[PDB]
Amino acid sequence: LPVRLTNGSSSCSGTVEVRLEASWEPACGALWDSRAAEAVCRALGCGGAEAASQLAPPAGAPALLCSGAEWRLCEVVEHACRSDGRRARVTCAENRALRLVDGGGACAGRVEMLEHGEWGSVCDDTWDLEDAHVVCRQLGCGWAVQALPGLHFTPGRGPIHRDQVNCSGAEAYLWDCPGLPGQHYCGHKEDAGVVCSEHQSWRLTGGADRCEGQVEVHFRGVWNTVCDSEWYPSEAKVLCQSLGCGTAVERPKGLPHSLSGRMYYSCNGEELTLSNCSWRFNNSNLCSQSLAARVLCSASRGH
Ligand SMILES: *[C@@H]1O[C@H](CO)[C@@H](O)[C@H](O)[C@H]1NC(C)=O
């Protein structure tokens, strides 16, 4: 009012935008000194400015001119910069962020939060699906499957930003929820975790050991089968390598699809995991007459 921060980590971070009579336009990358960064961060109510950056996107645009480090001394100009040029970005002192660590891939792991330039963990006391649902939506992983307690994933280090969290469910961020700070009540043994809908975990059931059997995948909070139509050595090489059982040896004939859903994959061969490949979940055109794909790796007792 009349400044805001969009497409960033929080409401106190991201690309700078200025309000006009027509619509909100991004601020100019040039003419963006640290004086204007302080004035904008302080006016929004986000404390001081930690760092100012200039990002490039893949009539003219407005700019923010300030004679001092205050909002009263700042002035907006209508046209004084090239339109399709580098924009202005900023991270204030009150900026917060969120990350999941040690969870065998993206959209899962230990819930870590950023507060005043320090990555800290959240306690498992009063941790439920209502708190996990807020975490999965802000990151872009859909809904929450399981709100895990401590010791499921590796415990964190450093500070503990929350000893108790009680989200209603509709909050945009985890920091907006009512809670209690780090008062030495909880410890790193109780570091909370989460499993979101978009996370992908794999295993091989049916065979002699862990690196042999039916290719199963945990997507959308349910175990699913893999289509044998597009299951060639390129896909099998990525699977046996990610699980850690060497190269692929054989791809036996599958059984009918007997789980919640069906998964499709199309790898080049050099991927680190099957989630990095091109995939489509529950596609009737690609998967119909197919069977549940299988694989036999090198490290198994069967080979
Ligand atoms: C936790 O949040 C719910 C609303 O989701 C509220 O009814 C309840 O009183 C809160 N717990 C405490 C201890 O205030």
Author numbering: 43 to 100, 122 to 366
Task: Give sentences copied directly from the paper behind this entry.
CD6 is a transmembrane protein with an extracellular region containing three scavenger receptor cysteine rich (SRCR) domains. The membrane proximal domain of CD6 binds the N-terminal immunoglobulin superfamily (IgSF) domain of another cell surface receptor, CD166, which also engages in homophilic interactions. CD6 expression is mainly restricted to T cells, and the interaction between CD6 and CD166 regulates T-cell activation. We have solved the X-ray crystal structures of the three SRCR domains of CD6 and two N-terminal domains of CD166.
The X-ray structure of CD6 is the first structure for a protein containing consecutive SRCR domains. The structure reveals a nonlinear organization of consecutive SRCR domains of CD6. Despite the interdomain interactions not being conserved, the orientations of each domain relative to its adjacent domain are very similar, both burying approximately 270 Å2. A consequence of this orientation at the interfaces between individual SRCR domains is a nonlinear consecutive domain structure, resulting in the three domains spanning 78.1 Å, a shorter distance than if the domains were in a linear arrangement. There is a disordered region in CD6 domain 1 in a similar position to a flexible loop in CD5 domain 1 (Garza-Garcia et al., 2008). In the recombinant protein, we observed electron density for GlcNAc attached to residue N229 in the second domain. There was no observable electron density for the other potential glycosylation sites in CD6. Using our structure of CD6 and previous mutagenesis data (Bodian et al., 1997; Skonier et al., 1997), we carried out a more extensive mutagenesis study on CD6 domain 3 to define the residues critical for CD166 binding. These data were mapped onto the structure, clearly identifying and defining the boundaries of the surface of CD6 that interacts with CD166. The CD6 surface features a stripe of negative charge flanked with positive charge, and the CD166 surface features a complementary positively charged stripe flanked by negative charge. Homozygotes for two of these SNPs (R225W and A257V) in domain 2 have been associated with susceptibility to multiple sclerosis (Swaminathan et al., 2013). These two residues are buried within the domain and may disrupt the domain structure and stability of the molecule, explaining the correlation between reduced expression and susceptibility to multiple sclerosis.
